[model samples]
Target: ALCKFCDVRFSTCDNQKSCMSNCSITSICEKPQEVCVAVWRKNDENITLETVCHDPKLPYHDFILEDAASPTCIMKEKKKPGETFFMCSCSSDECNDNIIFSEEY
Candidate 1:
């Protein structure tokens, strides 16, 4: 979802502090393999699918309290035409919790 130019870039900081130093603005989807991996993990975990998505720490999902955008567990409501089940994991905890494979139609 990266554009050549004209896009607002967001960043995060150490210890979850955005105002202080140690903050970094990462390229949107430039390192998409990484970001998408996180998102995909959430998707595979059923944390976002088959449930109303929300991130208490995130600023976008109808809640805004933090100075910066927070981490989220939102997933695509519908998969692409040919997309199907896949494996992704947020943690070993998720694996132990039985969160796996989401069927895409």
Candidate 2:
């Protein structure tokens, strides 16, 4: 099968410093995909729809966002075992409406 993300399917980063810097995106066939943006969060329910959903009691105390294009979590706290809620939002400056869609997935 062709590799996603353009790097060898399981190539080791032997040349640690330059491997990724020189690697090609077309080489990896199984390139990882992105998902809906978690515009808001809750501590008890799972977010399955797009809307302004958040638990005011939880108050969105904390958050975990990676880069500017990955799925982010708006958290009440980092404590485990608690539920987190999420919604999609505009990924680009042009997408003024904040909503998650399958295309973003």
Candidate 3:
């Protein structure tokens, strides 16, 4: 599968809006990857976007999509050690793009 992969902390992601820009760099996953994942995280008011390929059949929270077969990156807050985030999962080419974290999303 083809997915946009970026991380601001890793410096792979530089400019981003609701979603990252430098995600022109893509990630291709072949083994056991069934879903494209995007996470909108809030760490002390600043938000960063992260996209990755995840396995849906895995027992862990690698994929916690709210509704089954929903293509849009909707809402589901997962708390980190000190931060929090809303994640969405979809199964499509570069489906993790165009994230909107608001009431009208």
Candidate 4:
């Protein structure tokens, strides 16, 4: 089991065309041996998405990645407008290939 990893500003890869073109396949690694994590955050109109490869055996794994079981979405309110964050994990190779925030927001 393996997955892909990439990190870029959400604005840069906001659209399907941009994301696919900009965020290409970076690397792949086995699960258990290597864990795949995808994190996303939105502020105002700006969004930031990140994918990382880590080891579950390491400390701070849960701290950084709350859920490594499956795809998840969380909404937090720090201020009036608040922000939204998403995290997803997979065991298959290049599982984090595509991310679609929304077609209309």
**TM-scores of all predicted structures:** 0.18, 0.25, 0.64, 0.53
Q: Judge candidate 1 at residue 104 and give its lDDT.
A: 41
lDDT of each: 0.23, 0.27, 0.59, 0.49
Local distance difference test, candidate 3: 0.59
User: What's the true lDDT of residue 20 in model 1?
Assistant: 18
Off by over 4 Å in 1: 1-36, 39-68, 84-105
Model 2 regions lying over 4 Å from their true place:
1-38, 41-61, 70-80, 87-91, 94-98, 101-105
- For candidate 1, the per-residue lDDT at 86 reads 20
Model 1, 3-103: lDDT tens digits are 11111222131121112111132223333222111222132323221111222244332323231121222222324454432222121111211222232
Per-residue lDDT of candidate 4, residues 1-105 (tens digit) = 355566644545543421431356567564456666555566676777666676655632234443345442221212223333555554445555554444342
How displaced is residue 35 in candidate 1, in Å?
4.6
| TM-score of candidate 1 to 2 decimals | 0.18
lDDT, candidate 2, 1-105, per-residue tens: 111122112322231221221223323112223222223333233322222222222332254333235333222123435654433321222121223223433
Candidate 4 weakest ten by summed lDDT = 72-81
User: Which one wins on TM-score?
Assistant: 3
